[PDB]
């Protein structure tokens with residue numbers, strides 16, 4: 001199991017533009033196109049991202065390309081963020097993937113906001129962080145996904161993802 005497989009399980013693969021859980025236009029493996037209500041705007045972002053007139057539909061290969069760019073981007077945003085970097089560096093391989101997952105999902109800004117949980121992770125206080133992480137809109141809006149990520153941080157194994 002690795003980050004790619006992990007996020008593939010959490011995001012699915014869709015070849016036509018769709019609305020994510022917050023109602024935003026997305027495509028592929030969780031690639032947000034725009035927060036804008038306009039399908040046209042979505043359509044425009046997609047063509048620009050792909051480099052072709054897509055008509056709101058992409059191929060598997062194209063989906064995968066956006067996915068690789070997105071994972072890379074998530075890693076670099078962490079490394080560049082002053083609040084994220086130290087946490088990431090203190091963690092083992094499996095827990096690093098849980099941090100990337102959150103960043104991919106909510107952005108570096110969103111995650112950097114979890115001050116208290118970050119601190120507990122940095123201290124290696126797994127159960128306590130797990131409890132803190134759960135007290136969030138994140139956990140209340142997407143509880144299944146959140147539980148998988150949280151379990152990953154608590155246990156440091158891929159158990160939550162095996163079977164999927």
Ligand SMILES: [Cl-]
Pocket residue numbers: 049
């Ligand atoms: Cl892009």
Ligand SMILES: [Cl-]
Pocket residue numbers: 141142143144145146
């Ligand atoms: Cl969920």
